[PDB]
Design an enzyme around this catalytic site. Sequence first.
Site: not given
Length: 258
Positions: A62, A92, A94, A104, A117, A196-197
């Site tokens: 992901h 990590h 996004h 996000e 993040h 958020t996952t």
Amino acid sequence: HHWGYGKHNGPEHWHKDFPIAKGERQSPVDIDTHTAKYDPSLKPLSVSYDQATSLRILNNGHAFNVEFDDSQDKAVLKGGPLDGTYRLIQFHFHWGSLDGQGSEHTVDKKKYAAELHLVHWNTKYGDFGKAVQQPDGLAVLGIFLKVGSAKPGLQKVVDVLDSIKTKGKSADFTNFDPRGLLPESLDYWTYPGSLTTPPLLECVTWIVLKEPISVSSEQVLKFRKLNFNGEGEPEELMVDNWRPAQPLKNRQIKASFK
Ligand SMILES: [Cl-]
Ligand SMILES: [Zn+2]
């Protein structure tokens, strides 16, 4: 049918396996800068990353995580809205398929090219797994990336991505200093929220920095060469791994600055 970011398994589907997807303290959100309240009782953040020990970088299907040794108080976050000491476990990002999306959180509906993040857990709960079950278990530092000049401190990361292209691949990644990823100012917005996952647990105090860092077009291009799939399966590029903004509901965003 594992969750992901595609048409058939993407964020609008997640509620079927994780009903907390429609909960009262879901992340991310839009930060409306005119509605955020300045809170003069908020302390400055304290980020002590001088002793951080990175161990490994992993493509988990992901995102990619860089993992840190959290067996002792070596890289910690305190202050701000937090009580106690939160240890860094991983970071990590996004990112998007194009430079106009990827983040996000948004700021007055503005999307950034990516979002970093830095995930930390409250030491009073003893381990990460117990921490995610508590309302004040995690603290995530969110940092926006915009495309402009190159960030030297990120280059080390982008150069190993070739060795973890596909899901499940990992590589040794020692002696990385996360201080190279921080902006100059530590002014922030904060609000209570969630991962958020999946599993989207409502265990996060979000600290989102106001000042973005700059990365180059070439640096973000290398993120977009990674794969959601494992080795030997059909190629799906790891792009657009971001969850859309969720309803703020009964929450107030507080700002550390006016
Ligand atoms: Cl994860
Ligand atoms: Zn994240």
